[PDB]
C-alpha cells in the first residue's frame, strides 16, 4: 500500500521523509512523519510573501514600495538582487524573487518589512498554524541540524497552511491569486514533486535545500479535470554534508498520487 511504498522510499534513500498530501476532492490526507519537525529552508518563503500580502490588505500602496538594495544586504544565493544593488526593488518584486527564484537577499527584505522572524510566525499563528516556526534570517535559517527545532514545521501544518493561503481563504481575493501566480510562475521546481507528476498537470511550488542533504518542495497542484491537491514532501540526510536528493521528492510524489 502507500504506506509501505513511502516506507520503503524513505529505507532505500538513507535518510528522514515527510509527507503530507490533501485531496481536496475528498477531503482525505495520506500522511508519513507528518507530525515530525522538519527544517523548512526556502519552503518558507512562502509564508514570508503570505505575510507581506496580509499586510497589503489595508494598505494599497504597499506592493509599489520601494526597498534599496546594497552590497551590504548580499547574502549567499542572490541571483535576482545581485543585478540591482545601488538601485530599488518594489515589494512585489521582491516577493517574486522569493517565489520564483528563491533569492535570499528578497526574502531579507520581506522579512524585515513584517517585522523579523517573529512576526513572520506571529502571522501564522494567526492563520491557525501553531507548528511553524521561523527563528532565523537568511542565510542561516538553512542549517537544518538534526534535532534543531528553529526554523522548523511539520509536513501536516505546512500542507493545511498552504491549502489555505493558495485554496482558502487566509488572504483577500486579489492576494490569493497574487500567491498563486507568483508559485505557478516558480523556475525552481521542475525536478521535485512536479518531476513525479503527469506533465499535463499544473503545479505551483516552492522548493528549498540546506545542511544535512535538506530537499524539501511544497505544492498546489491542479490535475488534469480534477479538484486541486495540496503536497508536502520534506527530505533530510544523516551526513552534515549530503548531496540535494530531489529525485526522493519526484518519488514520494508519485506514490501519493497514482491512486488519482
Known sequence: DVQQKL?????????????????????????????????????????????????????????????????????????????????????????????????????????????????????????????????????????????????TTSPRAMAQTLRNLTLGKALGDSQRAQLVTWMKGNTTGAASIQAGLPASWVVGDKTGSGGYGTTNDIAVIWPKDRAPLILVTYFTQPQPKAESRRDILASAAKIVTDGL
Open 7 to 151: 516506507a520503503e522510499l524513505e529505507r532505500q534513500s538513507g535518510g528522514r521523509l515527510g509527507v503530507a498530501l490533501i485531496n481536496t476532492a475528498d477531503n482525505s490526507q495520506i500522511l508519513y512523519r507528518a507530525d515530525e519537525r522538519f527544517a523548512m529552508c526556502s519552503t518558507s518563503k512562502v509564508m514570508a510573501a503570505a505575510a507581506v500580502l496580509k499586510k497589503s490588505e489595508s494598505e494599497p500602496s504597499l506592493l509599489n514600495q520601494r526597498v534599496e538594495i546594497k552590497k551590504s544586504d548580499l547574502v549567499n544565493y542572490n541571483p535576482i538582487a545581485e543585478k540591482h544593488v545601488n538601485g530599488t526593488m518594489s515589494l512585489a518584486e521582491l516577493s517574486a524573487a522569493a517565489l520564483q527564484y528563491s533569492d535570499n537577499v528578497a526574502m531579507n527584505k520581506l522579512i524585515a518589512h513584517v517585522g523579523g522572524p517573529a512576526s513572520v510566525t506571529a502571522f501564522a499563528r494567526q492563520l491557525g498554524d501553531e507548528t511553524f516556526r521561523l527563528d532565523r534570517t537568511e542565510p542561516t535559517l538553512n542549517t537544518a541540524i538534526p534535532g534543531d527545532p528553529r526554523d
